[PDB]
Amino acid sequence: GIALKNVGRIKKHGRKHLVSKNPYLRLLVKLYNFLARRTNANFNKIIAKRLIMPKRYRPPLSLSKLQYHMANHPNDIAVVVGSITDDKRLFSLKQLKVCALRFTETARKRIEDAGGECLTFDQLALKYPTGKKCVLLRGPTKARTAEKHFGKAPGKPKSKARPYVRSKGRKFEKARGRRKSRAYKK
Amino acid sequence: KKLDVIYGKIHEKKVTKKNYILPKSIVHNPDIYRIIHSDKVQASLLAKKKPC
Amino acid sequence: AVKKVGKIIKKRTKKFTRFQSNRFMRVKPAWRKPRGIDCRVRRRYKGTNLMPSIGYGSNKKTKFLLPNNKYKYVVKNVKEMEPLIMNHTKYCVQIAHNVSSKKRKQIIERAKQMNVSVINAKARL
Amino acid sequence: SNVSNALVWELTRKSNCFIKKNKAGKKGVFLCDPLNVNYKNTPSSSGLVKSNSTNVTLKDGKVVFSVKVNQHFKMKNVEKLLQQHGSKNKEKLLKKYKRLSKLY
Amino acid sequence: PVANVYSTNGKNVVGEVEIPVVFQTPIRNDLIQSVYTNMSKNRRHPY
Amino acid sequence: ATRFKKNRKKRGHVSAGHGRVGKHRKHPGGRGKAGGLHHMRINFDKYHPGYFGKVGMRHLNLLKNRTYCPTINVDKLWGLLPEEKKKEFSENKDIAPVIDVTRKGYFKVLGNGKLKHNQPIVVKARYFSSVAEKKIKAVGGQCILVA
Amino acid sequence: PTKIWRRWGRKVNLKEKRYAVCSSIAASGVTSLVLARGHRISHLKEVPLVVS
RNA sequence: UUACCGAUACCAAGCCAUAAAAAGAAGAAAAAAUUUUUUUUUAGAAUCUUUUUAUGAGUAGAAAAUCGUGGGGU
RNA sequence: AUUUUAAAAUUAUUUGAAUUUUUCUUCUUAUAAUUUAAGUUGUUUCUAUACAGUACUUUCUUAACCCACUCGUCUUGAAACACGGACCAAGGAGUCUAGCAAAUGUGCAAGUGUAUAUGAUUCUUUAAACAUUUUACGCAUAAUUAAUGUAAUAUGUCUAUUGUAGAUUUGUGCCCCACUUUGCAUACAAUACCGGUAAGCAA
RNA sequence: UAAAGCUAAAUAUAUGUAGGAGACCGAUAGCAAACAAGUACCGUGAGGGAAAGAUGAAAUAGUACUCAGGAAUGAGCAAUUAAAUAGUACCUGAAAUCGUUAAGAUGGAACGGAUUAAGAGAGAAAACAAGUAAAGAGGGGAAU
């Protein structure tokens, strides 16, 4: 008998393997696991970790946010482990070198028309195997509507969680506990 | 020959799948071992280390 | 008790039997984990029907091979024996039960000229 | 492009008409491509993964030497043929052929 | 990237053709398998 | 699907994962939304705060077509029209685009976002927001009311 | 008791179906895959085989 | 006061699994006969391979990996 | 198959030194070997000069020493003087549909799903597949108010609010490090702006 | 433009009849009923309501003949069949339960765990001998 925590076995949390059985993504994961092991590059380690993540942690990054994040250094290349989506609110693009998992058709067309280029992660591993001049970016991992229902329960004081309701008219979840005139408010 | 017509090249009115774009790939060339053996990343790799 | 035959250690023989299968006919001896509440065997009371556990597992260097230090491979015709042409030292062959007498003879002669040993060589003759 | 040797191995490591598991003696898995010299289910031995590969197999009772585009021919002859279509592996093939020759 | 066209007598090759770009799509055995199971469910007769 | 079900993995476990003590009985708390305000009140108040009571006046028969109006913000007006024509209207300063958002399916133009500086644009819509009009004529454009 | 209102069919995304068809054609175009599926194609000249 | 006996605990060693870790995408070794033969092997599957260390009760309950049965594609 | 290496120790020669002054004194100079290094090796017998026995492997049956209460269950507590079970076979229990969410996989992405339906040399299979003359509908893309309604920096600038940490990137001291440069996600706050309510004014 | 009237199609069909199918059930299942089934049988009545399929290719092969028996049966040196231990309760023929033979144990339970020992059954795929020379049967490959 020995008095250890968790009986002496180190416990890790989070993903350990790719779940997607996409052969191309499996090949990419193999390549970047090898790259992360054989080079010291935290760049490659981060990319190898992010290729493994669920969909909700590879959110899209719009063109406007891409070109805003890459404003100050214009000759670098931006690498996103999500998808790049178009932004109709953006009036003009400018000469972006972007590596990404996937591009929507509109975003790809706009980037090539602006004269930049779209890169896959195998091309990124070919040309910048260490990540020189490569800026790691990610989209908003907490903007999705599911997070709007998370956190403190709707009903706890000063809670911002969205409740689960069929509809959102005046007669749905809006009388008692949501205004001072009916018992209390939140 | 009709495959190009059906899937977007040389479009004709009643044959081409309307507004359909052929799926693109996550990778550009899946020869990951050729990219690994390319000299740019071979120069990038650190020296082989040893196990326990 | 463990038995040793060269490098082969069998950590236990006399395979585990289901609790009370000795004194109940409707209880077959095939092992079942006693879920129970006051179950003696589940509680690991002394002197009764110990349960299997992973600790009995055999050394994985010698885990699946037969008393001839060869892995068994079961074949149904002559075409399934091609891979053994370059595995003849570490694999032995066994003819499937539902193979007729001609295919049996053909398999035996092909295995002999491949010098691959056969386990059930004298069946149906 | 679209395909690669690694991608083919990814597609065919599990689903294959040539894979024989060992259900009874659990440890073996054999790959029996026409171009698999040793029958290991391995990207380095799989003839449908390798770009070029030569081996010898018996077909309808006759030993035939095969080269991968997909050429077929009927010991000195095998040595000459291996020299003609050659890309350790050679010696392994020679010994495999000499073992094949002893088959009725 | 071209493919030779053969005659109904295999002994001959007639004018070659260019390989359609649809042959360059990702091969995607997982996607094919899942779509196949969902699709093949659609011809079942009730019981 | 049935061979992936969790009950299959409790096949010889007596209680089927439902407790040896509490058991799996039928409606031990009531049916549907029974106990709100009485014995499910913590759940109702913790997850559905404003559930009970009524607020507001009745609208007897609604006819949603009367008050239906989809909205668009000013920052998407330029993206409404194609890229090449956007470039044309940008390069040429004597011409402006006239966009009838009602044809695209929008009835009201809202004022969120930023329009391009010194780029005139005429917008036709059934309804306009105050700030939407302010931005449109701040960039040298015009709002036209249609119906 | 088995009922007739079981979910007999499945609605499949049109884009996913088209993707599957395109990928099946692409797979038919590569020799190792046609060999691995079970066809005895060791003797045909090229795998994207087209005749007059 | 000594010696001794005495656990599924402790110590050294082996093996199984669990967890973690170090690391990894190509060349002849021996032996037996008589320079020439013969016998074995001559590896490279990434949820993989090699090696290392620690660890292992368990109801209710949870999960993973496995084992079977009717029927359907391949 | 590129650490059972190197070192360490020992032996035999060898160079110098030191010292406890020497037949195991120590420290290196070089070479050659060894193992005390760098987890068991050798010899002789037997099995046996057999083809399955009186031996060896194995199953079973019997003893013998030590141990061993009837399972399932409710229960704080069951071997219970608690209940169910004479025996055996076969059957026998978290499923199906609707709806919601989370998780994960997949496609597409400010969109997405072509609903009912239509067409079309497909009409064993086929009740499935295939297709849809450049604002059908759902959900999403905007909130808020009982409500008339109103509706997100704001044209000084295609710019993209402000901080504190922070991934990545850039330099100077292709691989450690302190300052530089950039500042993702996110967290904590600050600011604006939208709807409602108050308050002040109110043509 | 009420207090009068008619009107086809697109729609529904656990009924009846007739076609066609199926990732359905496979004789304790599937309808209650695969069969002489809403039958036998029960209840005054309204009603309730089963069990029960399979020899063999062919009985246009369903057991002839003899012996012993009152007979049923049995046995055969007799007989159909590929087969009668397929003989009409007839395919296969499990378990509970019982019989015969053999072996063993046996002082108010029996069985068991763990370790061996003695018996008794089986067994050679590691549990010795590759090659070498001869003669006998064979099989293949290359060489004109």
The DSSP annotation for chain A comes to ----GGGG-----S--S-----HHHHHHHHHHHHHHHHS--HHHHHHHHHHTS-GGGS--EEHHHHHHHTSS--SSEEEEEEEEE--TT-------EEEEEEE-HHHHHHHHHHT-EEE-HHHHHHH-SS-TTEEEE---TT-SHHHHT-SS-BTBTT--PPP--S--STTSSBSSBBSTTSS-B-
Q: Does F21 touch chain C (CB under 8 A)?
A: no
D4 CA: distance to closest CA in chain A (Å): 10
Q: Quick one: closest CA in A to E26, which residue?
A: A24
Q: Position E29: which residue type?
A: N
In sequence order, the β-bridge partners of residue D20 are D30
CA distance A132 to A136: 11
Contact G20, E35 (CB under 8 A): yes
Asked whether residue C90, judged by its CB, lies under 7 Å from any atom of the DNA or RNA strand H, the reply is yes
Interacting residues of D39 by C-beta distance below 8 A, sequence separation 6+: C82, C83, C86, C87, D30, D31, D32, D45
Contact E26, G22 (CB under 8 A): no
Residue C95 CA, nucleotide J113 C1', distance (Å) = 38
Nucleotides of I under 7 A from a protein CB: 3, 57-60, 67-68, 70-76, 78-79, 87-89, 94-98, 100-115, 125-133, 135, 141-142, 144, 146-148, 150-161, 167-170, 174-176, 181-187, 194
Report the nucleotide nearest the CA of residue F56, measured to C1': I146
Residue F21 CA, nucleotide I74 C1', distance (Å) = 8
Q: Quick one: closest CA in B to A122, which residue?
A: B27
As separate numbers, helices (DSSP H) first and strands (DSSP E) second, chain E gives: 1, 2
Sort out which chain E residues have CB atoms less than 8 A from G27's CB and list them.
Answer: 27, 29, 32
Q: Position C18: which residue type?
A: R
Q: Do C32 and F12 touch (CB under 8 A)?
A: yes
Asked whether residue C48, judged by its CB, lies under 7 Å from any atom of the DNA or RNA strand H, the reply is no
Sort out which chain E residues have CB atoms less than 8 A from D3's CB and list them.
Answer: 27
Q: Does A176 touch chain F (CB under 8 A)?
A: yes
Asked whether residue A150, judged by its CB, lies under 7 Å from any atom of the DNA or RNA strand H, the reply is no
- E→G contacts (Cβ < 8 Å), by residue, are 3-8, 14, 17, 19, 22-29, 31-32, 35-36, 38-39, 41-42, 44, 46-47
Residue C124 CA, nucleotide J78 C1', distance (Å) = 36
Residue of E24, E29, E30 best to disrupt the A interface, most CBs of A under 10 A: E30
Contact F136, F99 (CB under 8 A): no
Report the nucleotide nearest the CA of residue F116, measured to C1': I158
What are phi and psi for residue C92, nearest 5 degrees? -115, 155
Sort out which chain D residues have CB atoms less than 8 A from C113's CB and list them.
Answer: 102-104
Instruction: State the helix-helix crossing angle for A23-38 and A42-51, rounded to 10 degrees.
Output: 160
Classify residue F74 by burial, with Cβ atoms within 10 Å: 0-12, 13-18, 19+. Answer: buried
Final resolution, Å? 2.7
Place of tokens 């050429």: D71
Residue F119 CA, nucleotide H5 C1', distance (Å) = 103
Asked whether residue C88, judged by its CB, lies under 7 Å from any atom of the DNA or RNA strand I, the reply is no
Asked whether residue A16, judged by its CB, lies under 7 Å from any atom of the DNA or RNA strand H, the reply is yes
Residue C98 CA, nucleotide J90 C1', distance (Å) = 30
Q: Do B21 and A105 touch (CB under 8 A)?
A: yes
F67 CA: distance to closest CA in chain A (Å): 15
In sequence order, the β-bridge partners of residue A99 are A79, A119
Contact D66, D55 (CB under 8 A): yes
CA distance G22 to G28: 10
Sort out which chain D residues have CB atoms less than 8 A from A28's CB and list them.
Answer: none
Q: Do D100 and C85 touch (CB under 8 A)?
A: yes
Shortest CA distance to C52 belongs to which of C37, C34, C28? C34
Contact A163, A141 (CB under 8 A): no
Q: Does D29 touch chain A (CB under 8 A)?
A: no
Place of tokens 């067309």: A109
Instruction: Calculate the CA dihedral of residues C98, C103, C109, C110 and round it to 10 degrees.
Output: -90
Residue F145: its H or E element: strand F142-145
Q: Does A26 touch chain D (CB under 8 A)?
A: yes
CA distance A76 to A131: 10
CA distance A80 to A61: 8
Residue G42: its H or E element: none
Q: Quick one: closest CA in D to G39, which residue?
A: D17
Contact D5, D51 (CB under 8 A): yes
Question: DSSP states of F86-140 as a string?
Answer: HHHHHH-SS---EEEHHHHT--EEE--S-PPTT---EEEESEE-HHHHHHHHHTT
Shortest CA distance to A52 belongs to which of A26, A79, A78? A26
Range list of H helices, chain G = 14-28, 31-37
Q: Do E35 and G26 touch (CB under 8 A)?
A: no
Residue G46: its H or E element: none
CA distance F140 to G1: 72
Q: Does F14 touch chain C (CB under 8 A)?
A: yes
CA distance B16 to F102: 32
Over D6-44, what HEC string results?
HHHHHHHCCCCCCEEECCCCCCCEEECCCCCCCCECCCC
Q: Does E9 touch chain B (CB under 8 A)?
A: no
CA distance A35 to A44: 6
Q: Tokens in use for D13?
A: 């490591």
CA distance E29 to D15: 10
DSSP character at residue F47: H
CA distance B48 to C8: 36
Instruction: State the helix-helix crossing angle for D76-84 and D89-100, rounded to 10 degrees.
Output: 150
Shortest CA distance to A153 belongs to which of F87, F43, E21? F43
A67 CA: distance to closest CA in chain E (Å): 29
CA pseudo-torsion sign D76, D81, D83, D88: negative
B31 CA: distance to closest CA in chain E (Å): 14
Q: Do F14 and C32 touch (CB under 8 A)?
A: no
What are phi and psi for residue C110, nearest 5 degrees? -65, -40
- Tell which G residues from 4 to 43 touch B, by Cβ distance under 8 Å: 18-19, 22-23, 25
Q: Does C72 touch chain F (CB under 8 A)?
A: no
Report the nucleotide nearest the CA of residue D104, measured to C1': J140
* Chains contacting A (3 or more CB pairs within 8 Å): B, D, E, F
Asked whether residue A12, judged by its CB, lies under 7 Å from any atom of the DNA or RNA strand H, the reply is yes
Q: Which of B27, B40, B46 sits opposite A24 (nearest CB)?
A: B27
Rounded to a whole number, what is the distance in angstroms from the first to the last CA of chain G?
A: 56
